[PDB]
Amino acid sequence: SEEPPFDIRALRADIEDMISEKLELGPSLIRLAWHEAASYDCFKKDGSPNSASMRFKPECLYAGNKGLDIPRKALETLKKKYPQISYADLWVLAAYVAIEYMGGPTIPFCWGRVDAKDGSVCGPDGRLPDGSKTQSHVREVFRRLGFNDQETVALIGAHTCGECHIEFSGYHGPWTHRKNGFDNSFFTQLLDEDWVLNPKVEQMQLMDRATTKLMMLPSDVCLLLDPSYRKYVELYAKDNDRFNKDFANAFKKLTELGTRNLHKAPA
Length: 267
Ligand code: HEM
Ligand SMILES: [Ca+2]
Ligand SMILES: [K+]
Hints:
Helix content: 40-55%
Binding site for Mg(2+): 36, 53, 59
Number of strands: 7
Binding site for heme b 2: 159, 163, 165, 169
Binding site for Ca(2+) 1: 36, 39, 59
GO molecular function: cytochrome-c oxidase activity; cytochrome-c peroxidase activity; heme binding; iodide peroxidase activity; L-ascorbate oxidase activity; L-ascorbate peroxidase activity; metal ion binding; peroxidase activity
Protein name: Cytochrome c peroxidase, mitochondrial
Bound molecules: protoporphyrin IX containing FE, calcium ion, potassium ion
Largest sheet: 3 strands, antiparallel
């Protein structure tokens, strides 16, 4: 489909330069595209997902979006060099590049996302999920977004990369030992390890009995306790390829919620 008004070929490359110069920016780019989309209520059809509306207060000030000012600022260096691309397209693409760069699937990109002009269109607070809660909450949040239990488990598989930071979320640590890689090793960490309480972190989180260097959230481990979710956990933990297929589709679907009139990018 149509050729975009910015140089995506150069852009894809420059984004990798930024990530290679700062690997912890990789996982952080995924979170930024995802919480931008998460405000969506599909039943109410509001929230204004995928419009880079987290540029403006209050959505940028929401408790669930703490520390996301870092990837946003990082992408400013590239908004200047490529004025033709919207913030919305750039957050999404920076995230596709981050996932591919880290060993994940290559997602077909689509462009045409209109930016929110000001923070008058933001969604209400409380749309973002709480890691302290479990599957009833999780299933409530992903239902509202428009995902089924399968897509729900796949999307959370992204915790295969990155880590929690006390000063951001109150939680702490990586989910896996390869926190800059992107595969199914989250469903594998979840299934193989013995998740004991971490008594030294005030917000309740888990840790592996084997090394105690890794961590899990109540919202992460609720994927075990729910029978539906555990089916898909076993599935993705054994089938890395299917995880890549399913993550790619869902994250694409996610980052296209509330969007119309997009165009397939060439490669
Ligand atoms: C119920 C669902 C989810 C909950 C409760 C949750 C919770 C959290 C928390 C507490 C953090 C720590 C933030 C920090 O302090 O750095 C985090 C980070 C992160 N989240 Fe999730 N998350 C959920 C689903 C997802 C999904 C669907 C994605 C993407 C597809 C995702 C991607 C990430 C990534 C990549 C990081 C690492 C960020 C970094 O290392 O800087 N999460 N999440
Ligand atoms: Ca939003
Ligand atoms: K990894």
